[PDB]
Design a protein around this nucleic acid. Structure first.
Lengths: 167, 101, 58
RNA sequence: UAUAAGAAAUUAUUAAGAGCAAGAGAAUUAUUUCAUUUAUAGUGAUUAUUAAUAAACGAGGAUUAGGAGAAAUCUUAGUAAUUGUGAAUUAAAAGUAAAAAUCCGAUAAUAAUGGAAUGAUAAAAGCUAUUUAAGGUAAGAUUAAUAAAUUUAAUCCCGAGAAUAGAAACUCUUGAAGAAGUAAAUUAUCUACCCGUCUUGAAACACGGACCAAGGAGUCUAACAUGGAUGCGAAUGAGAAUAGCAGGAAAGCUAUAACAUGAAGAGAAAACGAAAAACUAUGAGAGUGUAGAAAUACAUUUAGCAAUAGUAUCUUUCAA
RNA sequence: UUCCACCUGAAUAUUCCCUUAGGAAGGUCAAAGUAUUAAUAGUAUUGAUUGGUAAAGAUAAUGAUUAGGUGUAACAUCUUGUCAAACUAUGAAUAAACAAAGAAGAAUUCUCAGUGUUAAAUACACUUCAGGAAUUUAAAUAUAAACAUACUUUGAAUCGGCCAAGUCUGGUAAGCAGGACUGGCGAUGCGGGAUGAACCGAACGUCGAGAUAAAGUGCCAAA
RNA sequence: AAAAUGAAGACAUUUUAACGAGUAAGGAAACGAAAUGGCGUAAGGACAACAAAAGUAGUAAAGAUUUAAAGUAAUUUAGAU
């Protein structure tokens, strides 16, 4: 035998779209083709983010796009996730590419003069990515993250799953 | 596969081919030199085995110069050979003194 | 010295280094233990280190 | 539709005939390897050529009566001081200090010849020949100066690259009268303790098990959580009850809708109820230039998401 | 306590329990899911340390202890022999924790602000060595490390252990009881020791050919 | 594991390299380069001769017994009675 540190186990990185969605399966095929041929780090990033699970693809509201594109006028927002609508604040003019658009978010983006694009048009127009802004949504805002750990802890207590006789 | 990895091997092979042939020829000629040197040694021994032959005819003492030269050398070479012998004996005395402590 | 009971070692000669690399030589390329077959693969790996063939390797 | 390719069939001859499989070879080889033989730049020892001094050692000295050995010619045996051997040393001769053999060292390799296991069959960065010429660092050769030299110079040699041209497509044995392989039974060599379980440890003198068939043991309801797939998303559900529709229907479709969870949090409670339209660090991505040069490697311009940590500011509390 | 192949693969510490045939926190383990990642080390070297073990000592402190001189039994004093788990001046080997260039790879020059310290500061302290601009720059032990490294969540089983020894304690001693470090068996087959859980060699997909390891070469039994 | 290729070929692609012991235990399904791969029992919804008679079956079903073949195996397939 050979004195190895550890034996070969599957690498914990997803290499394909999860689930049986036919359209998401093709997008991974499209960007897997672009990443291999163009060898652009943009396509490798989009391909990697297409394979994340639903909880690792957090939503991005229109207010986040509005703030992140204030100094990028002739640019395209590229978020590999659903784009929701922040009804509290107005939507300026901007181009957004996303997997999914909320019905109220798409109406607000289009009414302001912007365009809601999908990832097939973005690859057609900007395959390597030239006037794009990469955006991902916040991950620590999940209310499940509050209960992780020990609530008796002295530094960062958990949040005590509610149940019997919770005061 | 050697040539694809070490293209210099063709040159080195030819040099080794030269040396092997040259050493064989050098060995062949020297073997001839000893054949007549030993033959000259043989005839002196057969000449001096007449010491067995015999009025107080006592103590056959044998000739000192019964061995004959087989390869001829110039005056400088004959003088240098004696000098070389003296050098060799000095090293033998030098090595023995060191080892003998 | 600390690992003496588990190894043996010494000082190699030129011929030992030659025969070891020529017969058992291999390079780690892209995580793969590829044996030495040509000088082109040696140049691709160690070319930046001014090593282009199997003799500079030796 | 133009071109070699040119299949089948046919004609004259004979070195006159399959497929597949197994076995034995032939020629040239790939990886690994066995056996035998062959050189290992030891200045190691010995390998009859003469003579001398020896540090040690025992014996021997001056007539054929009886023999040994040899065709020798020359020795051997035994009934008061000449001589025998010899480690080491030394002179002259020979010897340019590489022959062969053995021992002591040193290494283990080039190669050649026979095989073995797994293959391959094709032309070569094959090999061979012819040209010009990088090179040969003791050692390719001969020379000369000398010389304890892997020191010098000279001309002869051979010759890498490159260019020009060439040469490989084979035999035999066995098999539907049964090949190769496979299976069954027997024999032989090697090999093999009773399963399940508890246990540090059972083949155990630990327990259950005489044998066979069929049955036989992580399920259902309810609450919470994490996580993978899915719909919608500041909303989601509204197969809450319930009310209607066509169709006759425990199925399906429709109902601006109570409420649940969430969008706001802290406090026992009274009483309250979130911006400096944020800041700092590292960080995803996008362009250009140059070069290696095949991919790629450096310089430079811009961007700053996620995450983490830290800051101001704000809500509630005795206390953040 | 009922099908197969494949991959990874344990445990007997610590805390609490009316706890001792059992639980929960935690360690070891698996599966899922991430991050370009101030986020490598059961190693050595160099440098500055820490410790009080082995050893050593015994008119060096505490304690134990045999004898002999000299001066005034005794006491001083100079020697002598032998000692300490609850004695120590001194003190290793093996070790422990640092450094060997991450406010993000150096450095220098110029400019430089807010608070405070201060007698006052232009000194000093903290503020991304506040901040800002130029120039220079990839250097600073060895070795290894991108299927590296850092992990996050969820969860299983387990916490009766036993063995070895250039180790220790109780015991006359034990195949006895209990420990420190490591390697094992448990969970593990194979070659050898005739036989054997733990010894020695060496860890295992199905095979062919070779060199081997422990150990062997009269026969059983290969040599 | 990494490269290459990728609308359907096929054997769950091609090449290269490393690796493969194991009690308790874990690895649900789906996921084209698949986040392990499969065998078996029964029932339900579909599909099963594409040109208007559309899986097999009195020209012999299921079952039983054996003989051979495929698969590492769970098992499957076919012949004869």
């Amino acid at each position: 035998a050979i004195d190895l540190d550890r034996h070969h186990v599957r690498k914990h990185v997803s290499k394909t779209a999860r689930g049986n969605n036919a359209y998401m399966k093709l997008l991974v095929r499209l960007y897997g083709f672009l990443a291999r041929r163009t060898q652009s780090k943009f396509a490798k990033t989009i391909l990697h983010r297409l394979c994340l699970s639903r909880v690792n693809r957090p939503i991005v509201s229109t207010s986040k796009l509005a703030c992140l594109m204030k100094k990028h006028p002739e640019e395209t927002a590229v978020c590999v996730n659903t784009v929701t609508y922040d009804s509290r604040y107005p939507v300026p003019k901007m181009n957004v590419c996303a997997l999914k658009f909320t019905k109220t978010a798409e109406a607000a983006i289009t009414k302001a003069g912007g365009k809601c694009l999908r990832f097939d048009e973005l690859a057609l127009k900007a395959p390597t990515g030239r006037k794009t802004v990469l955006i991902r949504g916040k991950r620590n805002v999940r209310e499940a993250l509050k209960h992780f750990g020990k609530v008796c802890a002295k530094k960062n207590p958990a949040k005590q799953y509610k149940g019997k006789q919770t005061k | 596969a050697m040539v694809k990895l070490n293209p210099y091997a063709k040159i080195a092979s030819h040099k080794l081919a030269q040396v092997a042939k040259a050493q064989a020829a050098h060995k062949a000629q020297y073997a001839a030199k000893m054949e007549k040197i030993l033959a000259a040694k043989k005839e002196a021994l057969n000449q001096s085995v007449a010491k067995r032959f015999g009025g107080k005819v006592i103590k056959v003492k044998v000739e000192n110069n019964l061995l004959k030269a087989t390869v001829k050398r110039t005056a400088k070479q004959d003088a240098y050979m004696k000098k070389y012998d003296g050098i060799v004996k000095a090293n033998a005395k030098k090595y023995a003194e060191k080892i003998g402590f | 010295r600390l690992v003496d009971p588990y190894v043996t070692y010494g000082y190699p000669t030129l011929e030992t280094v030659q025969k070891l690399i020529y017969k058992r030589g291999a390079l780690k390329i892209n995580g793969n233990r590829m044996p030495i077959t040509s000088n082109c693969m040696i140049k691709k790996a160690l070319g930046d280190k001014d090593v282009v063939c199997v003799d500079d390797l030796v």
